[PDB]
Design a protein around this ligand. Structure first.
Ligand code: N1C
Length: 252
């Protein structure tokens, strides 16, 4: 108890109750998910990781949950993001111009949560969970997000948008979920353009970050997939959000 088994934070307190509650809330608000049996969803979620070694999780483990979580998303209004989720969420909340993964049942259920079990016992581990870096990448949380992010990217069509954090050292990071999963799962048959919005943090007079080497890398990767690339700087994210809320404004 002075040393834990794994290097990462343990399962979020009251995990089962939280997931169940989020599912009830989601299905009450969103009419197309109004029929989903939230007990069945919890049962499937549990089944993915309980009694399993938390370094031996596979995408197959989550297939029952994926099935129950089946959901149509407007394919042309998807917003992806990397390392900038708060702005992405504040943006979509104004008038639902776009949808992030957290606007789907499954993304909503898991957002900000951590979970894992133990091999050959049905107990949730509230003490520690595997860290992706130090322990193992095939852990319940990591495998969940890769699985759901892949399916989300596969559903996209027309123009897909991505918000990137321009204050980061690597504005586009090939090791992120966006860069390692979503970019490679957009379907060129369906997706016309990927448009990146590079969000400035250098506050109030800055460079053209669409010329950043990592952005040029992203452009190259997506161009070679037969998808067009566009990029825009958002210099003042505060002004941006205000203009979204009230486009009837002088600077907007
Ligand atoms: O929606 C989430 C999400 N919500 C919560 N999380 C998500 N990860 C990926 N996604 C999807 O991938 C990207 C973001 O992942 P990232 O590039 O690793 O950013 P990031 O590096 O900010 O993501 C950190 C992060 O936070 C958890 C997940 O455990 C994880 O790796 C988005 O486009 C989403 O569609």
């Amino acid at each position: 108890r002075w040393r834990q088994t794994w290097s990462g934070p343990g399962t979020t307190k009251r995990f089962p109750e939280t997931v169940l509650a989020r599912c009830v809330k989601y299905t009450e608000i969103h009419p197309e998910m109004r029929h989903v049996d939230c007990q069945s969803v919890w049962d499937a979620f549990k089944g993915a990781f309980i009694s399993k070694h938390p370094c031996d999780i596979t995408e197959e483990d989550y297939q029952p949950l994926m099935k129950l979580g089946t959901q149509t998303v407007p394919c042309n209004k998807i917003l992806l993001w990397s390392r900038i989720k708060d702005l992405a969420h504040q943006f979509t909340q104004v008038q639902r111009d776009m949808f992030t993964l957290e606007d789907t049942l499954l993304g909503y259920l898991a957002d900000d949560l951590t979970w894992c079990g133990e091999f050959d016992t049905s107990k949730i581990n509230y003490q520690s969970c595997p860290d992706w870096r130090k322990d193992c990448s095939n852990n319940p949380v990591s495998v969940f997000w890769k699985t759901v992010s892949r399916r989300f990217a596969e559903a996209a069509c027309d123009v897909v948008h991505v918000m990137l954090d321009g204050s980061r050292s690597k504005i586009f990071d090939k090791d992120s979920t966006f860069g390692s999963v979503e970019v490679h799962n957009l379907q060129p048959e369906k997706v016309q353009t990927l448009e990146a919005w590079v969000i400035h943090g250098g506050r109030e007079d800055s460079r053209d970050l669409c010329q950043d080497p990592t952005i040029k890398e992203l452009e190259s990767i997506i161009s070679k997939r037969n998808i067009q690339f566009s990029c825009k700087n958002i210099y003042r994210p505060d002004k941006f959000l205000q203009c979204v809320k009230n486009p009837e404004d002088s600077s907007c």
